[PDB]
Structure formats: C-alpha cells, structure tokens
Amino acid sequence: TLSPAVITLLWRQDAAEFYFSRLSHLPWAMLLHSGYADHPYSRFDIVVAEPICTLTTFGKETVVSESEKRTTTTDDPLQVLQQVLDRADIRPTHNEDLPFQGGALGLFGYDLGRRFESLPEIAEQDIVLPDMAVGIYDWALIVDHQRHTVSLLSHNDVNARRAWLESQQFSPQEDFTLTSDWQSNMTREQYGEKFRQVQEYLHSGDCYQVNLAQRFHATYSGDEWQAFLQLNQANRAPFSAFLRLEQGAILSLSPERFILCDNSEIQTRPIKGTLPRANSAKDRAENLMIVDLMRNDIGRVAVAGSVKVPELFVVEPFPAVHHLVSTITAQLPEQLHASDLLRAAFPGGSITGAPKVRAMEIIDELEPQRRNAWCGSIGYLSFCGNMDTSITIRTLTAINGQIFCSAGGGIVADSQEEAEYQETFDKVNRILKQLEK
Ligand SMILES: N[C@@H](Cc1c[nH]c2ccccc12)C(=O)O
C-alpha cells in the first residue's frame, strides 16, 4: 500500500501542544506526549482527531461506528479492532521515522480485562467510561524530537487536512478549578484492613504479590486541557496522553511503557519499587516477580526462545519519586499481530501482582470501586503493524463534574502496612497538590 502523503510543517519544540490546543475540546481528539522528557524513549509526540471509525466497548458489547454504518457485536474487542484495521485495506511499509501511520489510537481500560478472564463483580462500577474507546485515524501529526521535524501524514487528502488543521481554533478558556478537597475512598483503617487481607491471602498461598490501590476524588469545574498542560510540564513523563472522549477526559502523566511492538520487535518495561525524591532488597525483589510475570505473559505469543531480560533494576528519577524498572524483550511471530499480543498480556502484570487472575480477584474483592481507566493502557495500533502502549499509572479521570486519581502499591510478605500506605501517597502527592493550585 501506497504510503501516505506527507507534508512537513514548520518545526517548533512545542508543536504538539501548539497544534493540539485547537483540538483539545473535540471528542476523539487524542494526544500522546513524551513529556518533553530526558529519556531514551521520549522521541515522539503524536496527535489525531476526526477518526473515520470509532469503537466503544462497554462490558460485553462493542459499538463500531462509521459514516453511514453503525454495528454492535459481542465478539472479542481486540479481534474486532483488528478486523476493522484489516478491512480499511491500508497497509504502509514500516518507517522508523513515522512509528504511527494512521490506525487505531486510544484507551484500553483496566475493566476490559473482564473480557479476557472470568472475574468477580464485587467492586462498584461507579464510573460510566468505556472499557475500550478507540478511534480509527487515516491521518496523523507526528512530532520527532530526534530529527526535529513535524510531519502531517494522510492516507486521504493531505492538503485537505492541513487546511482543516489550519482553520481549527484555540477555544475560549474556562478556568480549571478543584471545588472540594481530595478525598480518599479508604480510611487508614480501611486501607489497614485490606493490606492485612492481602497478606493473609499471601500467607495462605493464593498469591505472591497483589497491587492494592486507593482512590482519590474531588469535584472540579473548568476545562481540563490547561490543567493537563501544567501537569505535563511538571511530570515530564515519557508516556503521557490527553484523551478527549465522548464521556469525559483522560489526563495521563504516565512514565510507564506497557508493550512496545516495533517492526515485530517486542519491548515491555514494567515499573516496580520506588522511594520518594537501588539495592533495595525488598523492592529489587518485588520487581523480579513482575519481570517473571511479563516473561510469561509475552512468552505466550512470542517466538520460541526469543524472550530476554536485557535489563534489571535501573533507577529512573522522576519528580515525585525514584522508580525501579526492568526490561523484557522478545520477537513477535510474523504470523501474528501486535493486537494478539496485547490481548495475551492485558492488563499489565506490573499493576495486578502474580499470579494475575487470583491477583485480580483479590483486587476486585478489596478495592471499593472498579478501576475503569486507571492502570489500563493507552496507545496505538498502526496500520503498518507497530504498536506502543503505556500503563495508565499517574493518570486522572475527569468526568461529570468529578476528577479521580488512584494510587497503588505492590504488596508482598515483606511489606509493612504503614510504609506501604505511605507509598501510595508518595506516587501521587505532587499531582493532587498541584491541582489544588
Ligand atoms: N513516548 C513515545 C510516544 C508516546 C508518548 N505518550 C505515549 C502514550 C502511550 C503510548 C505511546 C506514547 C515515543 O517516543 O515513541
């Protein structure tokens, strides 16, 4: 397939924020931003909007929507997504300077997991935001920080789209304000109780690590884009994203890559262990259990002896905390898609806690609400076959007047109740605080 047409645009370090600001209020407008980060994997920023097809999954049903046709289906949501992908009959050859050339882009929420495993339904469902919300885009705006170039690509009419881009305006305000203090869904004693429940479950053998999180919430008013813009500057997280959905918006400040699939080369970098702003025997041990997880997760689809562990226990300094990351690599077989892979490993072992299903069972049992978008993934499935995805840690959900932000902490035998309590706070204190002003 006839590669897309490309127009290079004027260069500017902030082009991503610059062009996106006139799209930010549009439903299905999405920005993947590398957080202006100093990082090996912070080369690109990508913008899309105006999809030619969208997919929305709520539970058991997926709605596939185009121009002139709307269908519903109970089939597997990633199978369905891949079928939509193949019928667009668009398949450009792979290009290291354009990792997305149109294709699927969006949100894969934590509860989407429910379509891949049978799970209990204890946690309350109190957020109405889809389990899968992704657009099919025949164009993209790509900002390359390595090469310094801004490329506008279209499989359609790339003059038409520059034209359309041009004309979009950056929209009269409305100031973001938090209208309540942050409030947790747990007291210290309720956290306390479920931390011990976790440990009795670890002591009685079901699991060996379980990620337990608390959720903070508040009322707010105003537009979320400016707030994103000040959170992004302060977090400089390499896998950040701003998603304007039909239901509300997602402000991700994630520094964590889930799965990269680049020209069939697989990379996943789970984050596990932190201290506030790396010999830490308990953490560089909590991480290894997650590394083994991933090993197993990607190796269910990977090329036979392709899984390697090129990197263990590296610390990366971030605004809020010091974190520990490991890296696992592998090769996708030429007969499968990045989407089969996503499906085999979703949701991320680093935010569930091995073994994954039993770990997800406890989470549903102890967390008072479903996680919805938090700890699910955001990313793209390009028409060229590449894939990149994050773990939506450090991520808020802004919907119907309310904004949410969760915080988790991995629990193992060696974990201590008050210190783990504090870690959940450590991870998001700069984010709750900045929003308060
Ligand atoms: N950091 C990625 C692009 C990116 C930014 N935010 C993201 C969120 C999800 C997936 C990818 C991204 C890169 O350089 O290629």
Side-chain angles (χ1 to χ4, degrees):
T1 295
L2 340 109
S3 280
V6 173
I7 295 186
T8 166
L9 253 20
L10 252 312
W11 175 254
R12 34 204 296 186
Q13 179 84 197
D14 74 347
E17 287 179 318
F18 173 78
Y19 302 93
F20 195 74
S21 287
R22 16 241 236 216
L23 303 186
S24 71
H25 218 243
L26 297 177
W28 304 99
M30 302 182 184
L31 160 78
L32 309 173
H33 199 107
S34 281
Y36 300 119
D38 187 13
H39 196 285
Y41 294 128
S42 86
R43 178 144 169 216
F44 300 100
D45 308 309
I46 291 165
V47 161
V48 293
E50 267 235 86
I52 59 185
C53 181
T54 65
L55 288 80
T56 297
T57 300
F58 268 100
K60 299 82 38 264
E61 186 170 78
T62 298
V63 175
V64 182
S65 202
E66 318 171 84
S67 39
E68 291 200 350
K69 8 276 176 340
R70 164 177 188 286
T71 49
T72 56
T73 167
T74 45
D75 297 333
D76 178 272
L78 302 176
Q79 176 184 320
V80 175
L81 178 50
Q82 194 54 247
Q83 296 159 170
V84 170
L85 282 182
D86 305 334
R87 123 251 302 222
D89 298 8
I90 293 177
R91 272 142 17 118
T93 107
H94 172 274
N95 179 329
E96 274 57 31
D97 301 326
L98 312 164
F100 182 67
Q101 313 190 230
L105 197 157
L107 178 68
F108 308 88
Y110 186 83
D111 291 314
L112 194 63
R114 290 166 199 272
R115 301 294 309 267
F116 313 137
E117 299 309 345
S118 187
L119 290 143
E121 293 207 304
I122 306 303
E124 165 191 37
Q125 192 175 178
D126 69 338
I127 299 176
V128 175
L129 190 138
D131 298 323
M132 193 174 61
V134 342
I136 310 307
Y137 298 98
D138 66 23
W139 68 280
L141 171 117
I142 307 291
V143 182
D144 200 331
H145 291 278
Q146 147 154 111
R147 305 213 273 109
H148 294 102
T149 126
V150 176
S151 324
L152 184 68
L153 73 91
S154 180
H155 286 272
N156 212 230
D157 169 1
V158 87
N159 283 344
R161 177 68 55 203
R162 202 186 47 63
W164 167 101
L165 232 188
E166 247 347 89
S167 41
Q168 308 300 311
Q169 288 288 328
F170 181 70
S171 53
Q173 321 197 323
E174 165 49 9
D175 197 34
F176 182 87
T177 169
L178 258 218
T179 55
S180 73
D181 294 312
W182 290 102
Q183 186 147 73
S184 179
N185 51 0
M186 286 186 333
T187 56
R188 170 56 183 90
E189 299 61 49
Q190 288 158 323
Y191 180 83
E193 176 172 358
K194 324 167 176 279
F195 174 96
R196 302 176 177 249
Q197 290 175 78
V198 164
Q199 293 213 144
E200 267 321 284
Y201 280 132
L202 302 174
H203 138 269
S204 77
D206 298 345
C207 258
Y208 46 103
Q209 157 167 184
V210 171
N211 187 68
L212 171 67
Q214 47 187 318
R215 167 172 93 180
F216 306 88
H217 96 115
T219 38
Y220 72 100
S221 58
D223 191 67
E224 315 77 346
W225 177 239
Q226 193 72 56
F228 179 76
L229 285 169
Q230 14 144 272
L231 291 159
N232 196 23
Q233 185 205 179
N235 285 80
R236 338 153 14 113
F239 294 82
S240 309
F242 181 99
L243 315 177
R244 173 71 72 175
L245 302 172
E246 301 181 323
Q247 294 85 7
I250 304 299
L251 294 60
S252 188
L253 300 313
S254 182
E256 184 163 12
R257 174 172 269 152
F258 177 34
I259 296 173
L260 169 70
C261 191
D262 164 21
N263 189 37
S264 289
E265 118 80 77
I266 304 182
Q267 189 204 238
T268 174
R269 302 178 75 233
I271 289 169
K272 256 322 169 233
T274 69
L275 262 15
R277 286 325 289 293
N279 277 277
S280 28
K282 216 276 316 327
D283 291 79
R284 55 181 281 6
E286 194 162 51
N287 193 279
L288 215 196
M289 308 185 181
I290 297 319
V291 168
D292 296 327
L293 183 40
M294 294 319 302
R295 279 208 240 194
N296 194 244
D297 267 357
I298 87 290
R300 135 208 245 165
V301 138
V303 172
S306 52
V307 170
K308 305 176 222 270
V309 184
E311 271 289 58
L312 283 161
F313 310 150
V314 152
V315 9
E316 309 177 10
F318 274 92
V321 134
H322 278 288
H323 68 218
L324 194 50
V325 187
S326 293
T327 312
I328 303 109
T329 288
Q331 275 289 307
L332 189 59
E334 310 238 88
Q335 262 199 277
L336 280 172
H337 287 102
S339 62
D340 297 309
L341 162 67
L342 175 61
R343 198 196 292 111
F346 194 84
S350 63
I351 50 87
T352 56
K356 207 141 87 178
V357 187
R358 175 69 192 138
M360 279 184 82
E361 292 164 358
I362 296 172
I363 283 147
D364 183 77
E365 158 177 341
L366 305 188
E367 281 183 8
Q369 285 96 25
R370 294 193 176 183
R371 294 178 167 186
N372 190 259
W374 186 86
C375 273
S377 303
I378 286 181
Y380 60 83
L381 285 67
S382 182
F383 283 120
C384 77
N386 294 328
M387 181 172 71
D388 199 6
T389 49
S390 85
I391 296 294
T392 53
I393 42 161
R394 311 301 193 267
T395 293
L396 311 99
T397 304
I399 170 157
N400 300 335
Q402 287 232 292
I403 171 150
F404 302 92
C405 176
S406 301
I411 290 170
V412 290
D414 275 23
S415 281
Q416 308 287 301
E417 182 177 327
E418 207 88 28
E420 182 89 1
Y421 177 64
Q422 190 55 47
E423 163 171 62
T424 64
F425 278 108
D426 287 337
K427 277 131 141 159
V428 303
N429 259 349
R430 285 176 69 271
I431 283 176
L432 311 175
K433 73 168 199 28
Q434 176 171 177
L435 280 185
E436 283 171 345
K437 3 59 123 264

